[model samples]
Target: GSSGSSGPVKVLVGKNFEDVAFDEKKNVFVEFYAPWCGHCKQLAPIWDKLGETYKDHENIVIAKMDSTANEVEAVKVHSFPTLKFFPASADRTVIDYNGERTLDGFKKFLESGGQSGPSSG
Candidate 1:
Protein backbone atom coordinates (compact mmCIF):
# COMPACT_ATOMS: atom_id res chain seq x y z
CA GLY A 1 0.00 0.00 0.00
CA SER A 2 0.94 3.68 -0.38
CA SER A 3 2.52 5.56 2.53
CA GLY A 4 1.05 8.35 4.64
CA SER A 5 0.61 8.96 8.34
CA SER A 6 -1.36 10.65 11.12
CA GLY A 7 -2.66 7.72 13.09
CA PRO A 8 -1.71 4.16 13.90
CA VAL A 9 -1.12 2.30 10.67
CA LYS A 10 -3.62 -0.42 10.14
CA VAL A 11 -2.45 -3.95 9.49
CA LEU A 12 -5.87 -5.18 8.50
CA VAL A 13 -5.15 -8.80 7.88
CA GLY A 14 -2.91 -11.77 8.60
CA LYS A 15 -0.67 -11.58 5.55
CA ASN A 16 0.67 -8.18 6.47
CA PHE A 17 1.12 -9.21 10.07
CA GLU A 18 3.47 -12.07 9.17
CA ASP A 19 5.30 -10.03 6.63
CA VAL A 20 5.63 -6.26 6.93
CA ALA A 21 4.46 -5.97 10.52
CA PHE A 22 7.32 -8.24 11.51
CA ASP A 23 9.96 -6.25 9.65
CA GLU A 24 13.26 -7.58 10.92
CA LYS A 25 14.99 -4.24 10.86
CA LYS A 26 12.34 -2.15 12.65
CA ASN A 27 10.92 -2.00 16.13
CA VAL A 28 7.12 -2.43 16.07
CA PHE A 29 4.60 -1.46 18.72
CA VAL A 30 1.17 -2.79 17.88
CA GLU A 31 -2.16 -3.28 19.55
CA PHE A 32 -4.64 -6.00 18.76
CA TYR A 33 -7.93 -4.35 19.56
CA ALA A 34 -11.56 -5.35 19.52
CA PRO A 35 -14.19 -2.89 18.37
CA TRP A 36 -16.79 -3.98 20.88
CA CYS A 37 -14.53 -3.51 23.85
CA GLY A 38 -14.92 -0.36 25.88
CA HIS A 39 -11.27 -0.12 26.85
CA CYS A 40 -10.24 -0.53 23.26
CA LYS A 41 -12.52 2.36 22.36
CA GLN A 42 -11.03 4.39 25.16
CA LEU A 43 -7.57 3.71 23.84
CA ALA A 44 -8.30 4.64 20.23
CA PRO A 45 -7.34 8.27 20.40
CA ILE A 46 -4.21 7.48 22.39
CA TRP A 47 -3.26 4.86 19.84
CA ASP A 48 -3.66 7.36 17.05
CA LYS A 49 -1.62 9.93 18.88
CA LEU A 50 1.05 7.33 19.54
CA GLY A 51 1.13 6.59 15.84
CA GLU A 52 1.58 10.24 14.97
CA THR A 53 4.31 10.65 17.57
CA TYR A 54 6.34 7.88 15.98
CA LYS A 55 5.29 8.31 12.36
CA ASP A 56 8.50 9.94 11.29
CA HIS A 57 10.74 7.57 13.18
CA GLU A 58 13.16 5.71 11.00
CA ASN A 59 13.21 2.46 12.97
CA ILE A 60 9.97 2.34 14.89
CA VAL A 61 6.50 1.49 13.59
CA ILE A 62 3.21 2.12 15.34
CA ALA A 63 0.33 -0.03 14.21
CA LYS A 64 -2.86 -1.77 15.26
CA MET A 65 -5.30 -4.42 14.07
CA ASP A 66 -8.88 -5.32 14.88
CA SER A 67 -8.55 -8.56 16.80
CA THR A 68 -12.25 -9.20 16.53
CA ALA A 69 -12.06 -9.18 12.75
CA ASN A 70 -8.47 -9.33 11.64
CA GLU A 71 -6.68 -12.31 13.06
CA VAL A 72 -2.97 -13.00 12.71
CA GLU A 73 -2.27 -16.67 12.06
CA ALA A 74 0.24 -16.99 14.87
CA VAL A 75 -0.54 -14.31 17.43
CA LYS A 76 -3.43 -15.65 19.44
CA VAL A 77 -4.98 -12.78 21.35
CA HIS A 78 -7.44 -13.12 24.21
CA SER A 79 -7.85 -9.56 25.41
CA PHE A 80 -9.56 -6.34 24.39
CA PRO A 81 -6.45 -4.30 23.83
CA THR A 82 -3.62 -6.77 23.58
CA LEU A 83 -0.52 -4.65 23.20
CA LYS A 84 2.67 -6.17 21.87
CA PHE A 85 6.14 -5.05 20.97
CA PHE A 86 8.28 -6.69 18.35
CA PRO A 87 11.74 -5.29 18.65
CA ALA A 88 14.42 -5.38 16.00
CA SER A 89 17.31 -7.84 16.40
CA ALA A 90 15.29 -9.89 18.83
CA ASP A 91 14.32 -12.21 16.00
CA ARG A 92 10.54 -11.79 16.23
CA THR A 93 10.22 -11.98 19.98
CA VAL A 94 6.69 -11.11 21.15
CA ILE A 95 6.98 -8.78 24.11
CA ASP A 96 3.55 -8.32 25.63
CA TYR A 97 2.78 -4.98 27.23
CA ASN A 98 1.82 -4.90 30.87
CA GLY A 99 2.57 -1.28 31.67
CA GLU A 100 0.35 1.73 32.11
CA ARG A 101 -1.95 2.56 29.20
CA THR A 102 -0.76 6.00 28.48
CA LEU A 103 1.10 7.78 25.68
CA ASP A 104 4.08 8.22 27.96
CA GLY A 105 4.11 4.53 28.83
CA PHE A 106 4.00 3.45 25.20
CA LYS A 107 6.72 5.88 24.22
CA LYS A 108 8.75 4.89 27.25
CA PHE A 109 8.43 1.20 26.45
CA LEU A 110 9.70 1.61 22.93
CA GLU A 111 12.47 3.94 23.99
CA SER A 112 13.58 1.52 26.69
CA GLY A 113 14.00 -1.34 24.16
CA GLY A 114 10.78 -3.15 25.16
CA GLN A 115 12.22 -6.33 26.65
CA SER A 116 9.97 -6.15 29.72
CA GLY A 117 7.24 -4.07 31.33
CA PRO A 118 8.31 -0.78 32.88
CA SER A 119 10.62 -1.76 35.73
CA SER A 120 9.80 -1.34 39.42
CA GLY A 121 11.42 1.54 41.24
Candidate 2:
Protein backbone atom coordinates (compact mmCIF):
# COMPACT_ATOMS: atom_id res chain seq x y z
CA GLY A 1 0.00 0.00 0.00
CA SER A 2 1.14 3.59 -0.58
CA SER A 3 2.50 5.48 2.39
CA GLY A 4 3.15 9.14 3.17
CA SER A 5 3.56 11.43 0.20
CA SER A 6 4.04 8.39 -2.04
CA GLY A 7 2.03 9.31 -5.10
CA PRO A 8 1.53 11.91 -7.74
CA VAL A 9 -0.96 14.73 -7.49
CA LYS A 10 -1.84 16.13 -10.84
CA VAL A 11 -0.67 19.62 -11.72
CA LEU A 12 -3.58 21.63 -13.04
CA VAL A 13 -3.92 24.65 -15.26
CA GLY A 14 -6.91 26.96 -15.65
CA LYS A 15 -8.34 25.00 -18.56
CA ASN A 16 -7.77 21.71 -16.83
CA PHE A 17 -9.65 23.03 -13.85
CA GLU A 18 -12.61 23.82 -16.04
CA ASP A 19 -12.74 20.37 -17.56
CA VAL A 20 -12.02 18.36 -14.45
CA ALA A 21 -14.20 20.36 -12.09
CA PHE A 22 -17.19 19.95 -14.37
CA ASP A 23 -16.85 16.25 -14.95
CA GLU A 24 -20.19 14.64 -14.16
CA LYS A 25 -18.72 11.47 -12.72
CA LYS A 26 -15.99 12.77 -10.44
CA ASN A 27 -15.55 15.09 -7.50
CA VAL A 28 -12.41 17.19 -7.81
CA PHE A 29 -10.57 18.45 -4.79
CA VAL A 30 -8.08 21.14 -5.59
CA GLU A 31 -5.47 23.07 -3.73
CA PHE A 32 -4.95 26.48 -5.18
CA TYR A 33 -1.51 27.57 -4.11
CA ALA A 34 1.51 29.62 -4.86
CA PRO A 35 4.78 27.77 -5.32
CA TRP A 36 6.67 30.19 -3.10
CA CYS A 37 4.18 30.32 -0.26
CA GLY A 38 5.47 28.87 2.99
CA HIS A 39 2.12 27.46 4.02
CA CYS A 40 1.66 25.84 0.65
CA LYS A 41 5.07 24.23 0.87
CA GLN A 42 4.20 22.93 4.31
CA LEU A 43 1.04 21.33 3.00
CA ALA A 44 2.75 19.78 0.00
CA PRO A 45 3.74 16.53 1.62
CA ILE A 46 0.41 16.01 3.29
CA TRP A 47 -1.42 16.80 0.07
CA ASP A 48 0.82 14.41 -1.82
CA LYS A 49 0.18 11.67 0.69
CA LEU A 50 -3.54 12.23 0.53
CA GLY A 51 -3.40 12.05 -3.23
CA GLU A 52 -1.56 8.75 -2.96
CA THR A 53 -4.19 7.35 -0.65
CA TYR A 54 -6.88 8.08 -3.19
CA LYS A 55 -4.91 7.56 -6.37
CA ASP A 56 -7.02 4.62 -7.32
CA HIS A 57 -10.38 6.18 -6.57
CA GLU A 58 -12.31 6.63 -9.75
CA ASN A 59 -14.67 9.27 -8.38
CA ILE A 60 -12.22 11.43 -6.48
CA VAL A 61 -9.26 13.35 -7.84
CA ILE A 62 -6.68 15.28 -5.90
CA ALA A 63 -5.00 18.09 -7.76
CA LYS A 64 -3.20 21.39 -7.31
CA MET A 65 -2.89 24.50 -9.40
CA ASP A 66 -0.15 27.05 -8.99
CA SER A 67 -2.15 30.18 -8.40
CA THR A 68 0.77 32.23 -9.53
CA ALA A 69 0.46 30.71 -12.95
CA ASN A 70 -3.13 29.66 -13.24
CA GLU A 71 -6.39 31.45 -12.68
CA VAL A 72 -9.45 29.56 -11.46
CA GLU A 73 -12.05 32.23 -10.79
CA ALA A 74 -14.55 29.81 -9.30
CA VAL A 75 -12.02 29.09 -6.57
CA LYS A 76 -10.49 32.52 -6.28
CA VAL A 77 -7.50 31.93 -4.07
CA HIS A 78 -6.55 34.89 -1.93
CA SER A 79 -4.57 32.72 0.49
CA PHE A 80 -1.44 30.71 0.01
CA PRO A 81 -3.09 27.31 0.06
CA THR A 82 -6.81 27.22 -0.39
CA LEU A 83 -8.58 23.88 -0.60
CA LYS A 84 -11.78 23.59 -2.57
CA PHE A 85 -14.07 20.67 -3.27
CA PHE A 86 -15.99 20.76 -6.54
CA PRO A 87 -18.90 18.40 -6.76
CA ALA A 88 -19.47 16.43 -9.93
CA SER A 89 -21.46 18.46 -12.45
CA ALA A 90 -22.13 21.00 -9.75
CA ASP A 91 -19.35 23.48 -10.19
CA ARG A 92 -21.21 26.29 -8.44
CA THR A 93 -21.38 24.43 -5.14
CA VAL A 94 -17.65 24.42 -4.46
CA ILE A 95 -16.78 23.79 -0.84
CA ASP A 96 -13.89 25.52 0.85
CA TYR A 97 -11.93 23.11 3.01
CA ASN A 98 -10.49 24.27 6.30
CA GLY A 99 -10.01 20.91 7.98
CA GLU A 100 -6.89 19.37 9.45
CA ARG A 101 -3.99 19.10 7.09
CA THR A 102 -2.94 15.72 8.44
CA LEU A 103 -3.38 12.51 6.53
CA ASP A 104 -6.00 11.20 8.89
CA GLY A 105 -7.98 14.41 8.82
CA PHE A 106 -7.89 14.44 5.07
CA LYS A 107 -9.00 10.83 5.00
CA LYS A 108 -11.84 11.67 7.33
CA PHE A 109 -12.92 14.51 5.06
CA LEU A 110 -12.98 12.11 2.16
CA GLU A 111 -14.96 9.56 4.12
CA SER A 112 -17.44 12.21 5.14
CA GLY A 113 -18.27 13.20 1.59
CA GLY A 114 -16.29 16.38 1.18
CA GLN A 115 -18.77 17.78 -1.27
CA SER A 116 -21.62 17.91 1.19
CA GLY A 117 -20.41 21.09 2.89
CA PRO A 118 -17.46 23.31 3.61
CA SER A 119 -15.11 21.93 6.25
CA SER A 120 -14.64 24.16 9.26
CA GLY A 121 -11.62 22.30 10.63
Candidate 3:
Protein backbone atom coordinates (compact mmCIF):
# COMPACT_ATOMS: atom_id res chain seq x y z
CA GLY A 1 0.00 0.00 0.00
CA SER A 2 1.20 3.53 -0.78
CA SER A 3 1.84 5.16 2.58
CA GLY A 4 -1.71 6.53 2.47
CA SER A 5 -0.47 9.03 5.03
CA SER A 6 -0.65 12.21 3.00
CA GLY A 7 -3.40 12.31 0.43
CA PRO A 8 -5.65 9.79 -1.16
CA VAL A 9 -5.02 8.52 -4.63
CA LYS A 10 -8.22 7.04 -5.82
CA VAL A 11 -8.09 3.31 -5.40
CA LEU A 12 -9.59 1.88 -8.55
CA VAL A 13 -11.23 -1.47 -9.13
CA GLY A 14 -12.87 -3.19 -12.09
CA LYS A 15 -16.27 -1.98 -10.96
CA ASN A 16 -15.59 1.77 -10.84
CA PHE A 17 -12.68 1.83 -13.28
CA GLU A 18 -14.61 3.31 -16.18
CA ASP A 19 -16.55 5.74 -14.00
CA VAL A 20 -13.30 7.48 -13.13
CA ALA A 21 -10.75 6.73 -15.84
CA PHE A 22 -13.21 7.06 -18.69
CA ASP A 23 -14.69 10.35 -17.54
CA GLU A 24 -13.52 12.01 -20.77
CA LYS A 25 -13.04 15.27 -18.88
CA LYS A 26 -10.13 14.52 -16.60
CA ASN A 27 -6.55 13.42 -17.14
CA VAL A 28 -6.07 10.27 -15.12
CA PHE A 29 -2.66 8.78 -14.42
CA VAL A 30 -2.99 5.25 -13.17
CA GLU A 31 -0.25 3.04 -11.84
CA PHE A 32 -0.86 -0.66 -12.25
CA TYR A 33 1.05 -2.50 -9.57
CA ALA A 34 1.14 -5.56 -7.42
CA PRO A 35 1.45 -5.67 -3.66
CA TRP A 36 4.47 -7.94 -3.76
CA CYS A 37 6.40 -6.03 -6.42
CA GLY A 38 9.68 -4.57 -5.22
CA HIS A 39 9.76 -1.91 -7.88
CA CYS A 40 6.20 -1.08 -7.15
CA LYS A 41 7.04 -0.56 -3.52
CA GLN A 42 9.89 1.74 -4.50
CA LEU A 43 7.59 3.81 -6.66
CA ALA A 44 4.99 4.11 -3.94
CA PRO A 45 6.50 7.17 -2.28
CA ILE A 46 7.00 8.97 -5.57
CA TRP A 47 3.45 8.13 -6.60
CA ASP A 48 2.15 9.32 -3.28
CA LYS A 49 4.06 12.55 -3.54
CA LEU A 50 2.73 13.02 -7.03
CA GLY A 51 -0.74 12.56 -5.70
CA GLU A 52 -0.26 15.14 -2.97
CA THR A 53 1.40 17.58 -5.30
CA TYR A 54 -1.54 17.58 -7.62
CA LYS A 55 -4.26 17.11 -5.09
CA ASP A 56 -5.75 20.49 -5.89
CA HIS A 57 -5.79 20.16 -9.63
CA GLU A 58 -9.34 19.73 -10.79
CA ASN A 59 -8.58 18.37 -14.24
CA ILE A 60 -5.98 15.86 -13.20
CA VAL A 61 -6.10 12.76 -11.02
CA ILE A 62 -3.58 10.25 -9.70
CA ALA A 63 -4.77 6.72 -9.22
CA LYS A 64 -3.63 3.12 -8.90
CA MET A 65 -5.04 -0.33 -9.43
CA ASP A 66 -3.69 -3.67 -8.35
CA SER A 67 -3.47 -5.53 -11.63
CA THR A 68 -3.62 -8.75 -9.74
CA ALA A 69 -7.09 -7.81 -8.60
CA ASN A 70 -8.46 -5.50 -11.25
CA GLU A 71 -9.28 -6.34 -14.85
CA VAL A 72 -9.51 -3.27 -17.04
CA GLU A 73 -10.15 -4.17 -20.66
CA ALA A 74 -9.42 -0.68 -22.00
CA VAL A 75 -5.71 -1.40 -21.87
CA LYS A 76 -3.35 -4.29 -21.28
CA VAL A 77 -1.17 -4.06 -18.20
CA HIS A 78 1.81 -6.29 -18.91
CA SER A 79 4.25 -5.17 -16.24
CA PHE A 80 4.26 -4.29 -12.60
CA PRO A 81 4.16 -0.59 -11.68
CA THR A 82 3.23 0.23 -15.27
CA LEU A 83 2.06 3.82 -15.47
CA LYS A 84 -0.45 4.95 -18.07
CA PHE A 85 -1.62 8.51 -18.64
CA PHE A 86 -5.17 8.80 -19.83
CA PRO A 87 -5.79 12.18 -21.37
CA ALA A 88 -9.21 13.77 -21.45
CA SER A 89 -10.93 12.32 -24.46
CA ALA A 90 -14.23 10.83 -25.39
CA ASP A 91 -12.52 7.50 -25.97
CA ARG A 92 -10.06 7.95 -23.10
CA THR A 93 -6.93 7.29 -25.13
CA VAL A 94 -3.99 6.19 -23.02
CA ILE A 95 -0.33 7.16 -23.29
CA ASP A 96 2.20 4.72 -21.95
CA TYR A 97 4.52 6.32 -19.41
CA ASN A 98 8.11 5.89 -20.54
CA GLY A 99 9.96 8.68 -18.84
CA GLU A 100 12.30 8.81 -15.91
CA ARG A 101 10.69 7.52 -12.72
CA THR A 102 11.53 10.61 -10.77
CA LEU A 103 9.31 13.29 -9.35
CA ASP A 104 10.50 15.87 -11.87
CA GLY A 105 10.04 13.47 -14.75
CA PHE A 106 6.49 12.72 -13.69
CA LYS A 107 5.68 16.38 -13.11
CA LYS A 108 6.85 17.26 -16.59
CA PHE A 109 4.73 14.54 -18.13
CA LEU A 110 1.65 15.58 -16.21
CA GLU A 111 2.17 19.29 -16.82
CA SER A 112 2.36 18.64 -20.55
CA GLY A 113 -0.84 16.65 -20.36
CA GLY A 114 0.77 13.76 -22.24
CA GLN A 115 1.81 15.83 -25.24
CA SER A 116 5.32 14.39 -25.39
CA GLY A 117 4.80 12.74 -28.76
CA PRO A 118 4.11 13.91 -32.25
CA SER A 119 0.94 15.88 -32.85
CA SER A 120 -2.03 13.97 -34.16
CA GLY A 121 -5.78 13.99 -34.35
Candidate 4:
Protein backbone atom coordinates (compact mmCIF):
# COMPACT_ATOMS: atom_id res chain seq x y z
CA GLY A 1 0.00 0.00 0.00
CA SER A 2 1.11 3.58 -0.58
CA SER A 3 1.88 4.52 3.02
CA GLY A 4 1.85 8.17 2.04
CA SER A 5 -1.09 10.04 0.51
CA SER A 6 -3.57 8.84 -2.11
CA GLY A 7 -1.37 7.57 -4.97
CA PRO A 8 -2.76 10.12 -7.53
CA VAL A 9 -6.49 10.04 -7.91
CA LYS A 10 -7.27 13.69 -8.59
CA VAL A 11 -7.69 14.21 -4.84
CA LEU A 12 -7.28 17.58 -3.22
CA VAL A 13 -5.15 18.42 -0.25
CA GLY A 14 -4.76 21.48 1.94
CA LYS A 15 -4.57 24.27 -0.53
CA ASN A 16 -6.19 27.49 -1.66
CA PHE A 17 -9.69 27.31 -0.28
CA GLU A 18 -11.46 29.45 -2.82
CA ASP A 19 -9.64 27.68 -5.61
CA VAL A 20 -10.28 24.09 -4.53
CA ALA A 21 -13.76 24.90 -3.35
CA PHE A 22 -14.72 25.75 -6.87
CA ASP A 23 -12.70 23.19 -8.82
CA GLU A 24 -15.81 21.31 -9.79
CA LYS A 25 -18.00 24.02 -11.14
CA LYS A 26 -20.51 21.35 -11.88
CA ASN A 27 -20.52 18.86 -9.00
CA VAL A 28 -17.76 17.92 -6.60
CA PHE A 29 -17.13 14.48 -5.18
CA VAL A 30 -15.07 14.91 -2.05
CA GLU A 31 -13.74 11.73 -0.53
CA PHE A 32 -12.20 11.83 2.90
CA TYR A 33 -9.80 8.92 3.23
CA ALA A 34 -6.78 7.70 5.16
CA PRO A 35 -4.26 5.68 3.15
CA TRP A 36 -3.48 3.39 6.07
CA CYS A 37 -7.08 2.35 6.27
CA GLY A 38 -8.00 -0.98 4.72
CA HIS A 39 -11.38 0.30 3.66
CA CYS A 40 -9.87 3.30 1.98
CA LYS A 41 -7.44 1.09 0.07
CA GLN A 42 -10.30 -1.07 -1.12
CA LEU A 43 -12.12 1.95 -2.46
CA ALA A 44 -9.07 3.31 -4.28
CA PRO A 45 -9.52 1.46 -7.53
CA ILE A 46 -13.21 2.20 -7.78
CA TRP A 47 -12.40 5.83 -7.27
CA ASP A 48 -9.88 5.60 -10.10
CA LYS A 49 -12.43 4.20 -12.51
CA LEU A 50 -14.88 6.90 -11.47
CA GLY A 51 -12.37 9.55 -12.45
CA GLU A 52 -11.88 7.87 -15.80
CA THR A 53 -15.56 7.20 -16.44
CA TYR A 54 -16.44 10.75 -15.65
CA LYS A 55 -13.34 12.37 -17.06
CA ASP A 56 -15.39 14.13 -19.66
CA HIS A 57 -17.95 15.34 -17.16
CA GLU A 58 -16.57 18.81 -16.76
CA ASN A 59 -19.46 19.53 -14.46
CA ILE A 60 -18.24 16.94 -11.97
CA VAL A 61 -15.07 17.03 -9.90
CA ILE A 62 -13.49 14.14 -8.00
CA ALA A 63 -11.50 15.35 -5.01
CA LYS A 64 -10.04 13.60 -2.00
CA MET A 65 -8.41 14.75 1.21
CA ASP A 66 -6.06 12.94 3.56
CA SER A 67 -7.36 12.85 7.09
CA THR A 68 -3.88 11.98 8.38
CA ALA A 69 -2.83 15.54 7.57
CA ASN A 70 -5.95 16.94 9.16
CA GLU A 71 -6.62 15.19 12.46
CA VAL A 72 -8.30 18.27 13.84
CA GLU A 73 -10.31 18.42 10.64
CA ALA A 74 -10.45 14.65 10.56
CA VAL A 75 -12.35 14.54 13.80
CA LYS A 76 -15.26 15.96 11.84
CA VAL A 77 -15.07 12.85 9.73
CA HIS A 78 -17.66 10.86 11.71
CA SER A 79 -17.00 7.70 9.75
CA PHE A 80 -14.23 5.82 8.00
CA PRO A 81 -15.59 6.53 4.53
CA THR A 82 -16.93 10.05 4.65
CA LEU A 83 -18.24 11.13 1.28
CA LYS A 84 -19.75 14.44 0.26
CA PHE A 85 -21.30 15.78 -2.87
CA PHE A 86 -21.07 19.40 -3.87
CA PRO A 87 -23.81 20.61 -6.13
CA ALA A 88 -23.27 23.61 -8.37
CA SER A 89 -24.87 25.85 -5.83
CA ALA A 90 -23.85 28.37 -3.24
CA ASP A 91 -24.08 25.81 -0.44
CA ARG A 92 -23.30 22.13 -0.72
CA THR A 93 -24.82 19.33 1.34
CA VAL A 94 -23.15 16.17 2.61
CA ILE A 95 -24.86 13.00 1.44
CA ASP A 96 -26.03 10.48 4.00
CA TYR A 97 -24.84 6.92 3.41
CA ASN A 98 -25.28 3.59 5.16
CA GLY A 99 -23.69 0.45 3.75
CA GLU A 100 -20.47 -1.39 3.05
CA ARG A 101 -17.41 0.26 1.49
CA THR A 102 -17.55 -0.68 -2.13
CA LEU A 103 -17.54 0.90 -5.61
CA ASP A 104 -21.30 0.57 -5.66
CA GLY A 105 -21.67 2.69 -2.57
CA PHE A 106 -19.40 5.34 -4.01
CA LYS A 107 -21.20 5.35 -7.31
CA LYS A 108 -24.55 5.63 -5.60
CA PHE A 109 -23.36 8.43 -3.35
CA LEU A 110 -22.25 10.49 -6.32
CA GLU A 111 -25.06 9.57 -8.60
CA SER A 112 -28.04 11.83 -9.01
CA GLY A 113 -30.98 11.49 -6.58
CA GLY A 114 -29.01 10.31 -3.56
CA GLN A 115 -30.49 10.62 -0.11
CA SER A 116 -30.18 14.25 0.91
CA GLY A 117 -29.66 15.03 4.60
CA PRO A 118 -27.22 16.34 7.22
CA SER A 119 -24.49 14.37 8.91
CA SER A 120 -24.27 13.70 12.64
CA GLY A 121 -21.74 15.77 14.50
Give the candidate number with the greatest lDDT.
3
Winner on lDDT (2 vs 4): 2
Q: Which stretches of candidate 1 lie over 4 Å from their true place?
A: 1-12, 117-121
Poorest lDDT segment (10 consecutive residues) of candidate 4: 16-25
lDDT of 2 at 20: 63
Which candidate leads in TM-score? 3
Q: TM-scores of the models, in the given order? A: 0.83, 0.81, 0.86, 0.66
lDDT of 2 by residue, 48-74 (tens): 888877777887888777888988666
Q: List lDDT for all candidates, in order.
A: 0.78, 0.74, 0.83, 0.59
For residues 13-91, could you state the per-residue lDDT of candidate 3 as single tens digits?
A: 8899878876687998888988888999988888888887777688888887888888878879888888899889889
lDDT of 1: 0.78
Q: How would the candidate models be sorted by lDDT, starting from the highest? A: 3, 1, 2, 4
Candidate 3 at 54: error in angstroms? 1.1
**Ordered list by TM-score, greatest first:** 3, 1, 2, 4
TM-score, candidate 4, is 0.66
Clashing pairs in 2: none
Kindly give the number of clashing pairs for every candidate: 0, 0, 0, 0
